[PDB]
Amino acid sequence: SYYAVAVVKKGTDFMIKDLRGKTSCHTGLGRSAGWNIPIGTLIHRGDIEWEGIESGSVEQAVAKFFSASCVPGATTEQKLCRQCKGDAKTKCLRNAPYSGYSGAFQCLKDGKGDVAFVKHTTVQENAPEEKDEYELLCLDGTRQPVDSYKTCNWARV
Numbered sequence: 001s002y003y004a005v006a007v008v009k010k011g012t013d014f015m016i017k018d019l020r021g022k023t024s025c026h027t028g029l030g031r032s033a034g035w036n037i038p039i040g041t042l043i044h045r046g047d048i049e050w051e052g053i054e055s056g057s058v059e060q061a062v063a064k065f066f067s068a069s070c071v072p073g074a075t076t077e078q079k080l081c082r083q084c085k086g087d088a089k090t091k092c093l094r095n096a097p098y099s100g101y102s103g104a105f106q107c108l109k110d111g112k113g114d115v116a117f118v119k120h121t122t123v124q125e126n127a128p129e130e131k132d133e134y135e136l137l138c139l140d141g142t143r144q145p146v147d148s149y150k151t152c153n154w155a156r157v
């Protein structure tokens with residue numbers, strides 16, 4: 001079991017309703033915590049306007065919402081690769097430097113995204129001496145500490 005969480009830095013003050021126009025770090029296209037849960041959550045609050053697939057791409061809809069992102073595996077929207085770290089031709093592949101739970105978290109740490117969609121063990125696993133520099137974005141419009149995932153997660157997977 002795990003809990004999908006949205007990690008942000010303590011220096012910022014935006015909440016979930018204020019995500020439009022921010023930059024985002026994702027584990028990869030089509031993965032659970034990094035894409036299916038957050039994007040679906042945003043589509044259902046009505047923040048990302050997608051009503052259905054007509055030629056319709058979710059990628060297009062997301063690229064319109066975030067100003068830029070890193071979404072390893074993205075196929076059609078270059079904006080979704082803009083924040084990725086790496087070489088000109090592989091930075092956006094599904095096994096790129098910012099891919100995976102560790103890579104999405106590094107993208108936030110490096111300041112290449114304002115939010116990283118990862119799981120509840122991610123900050124602890126990758127920056128245990130820096131946990132206090134991060135917090136989580138809750139569905140109810142607040143922020144809570146990294147260890148408070150049980151009451152501040154977007155879904156239990």
Ligand SMILES: O=C(O)CN(CC(=O)O)CC(=O)O
Pocket residue numbers: 030031032033157
């Ligand atoms: O995200 C996925 O699509 C698949 N997962 C499990 C999961 O997150 O539930 C394995 C992994 O990404 O390593």
Ligand SMILES: [Fe+3]
Pocket residue numbers: 031032033
């Ligand atoms: Fe996963």
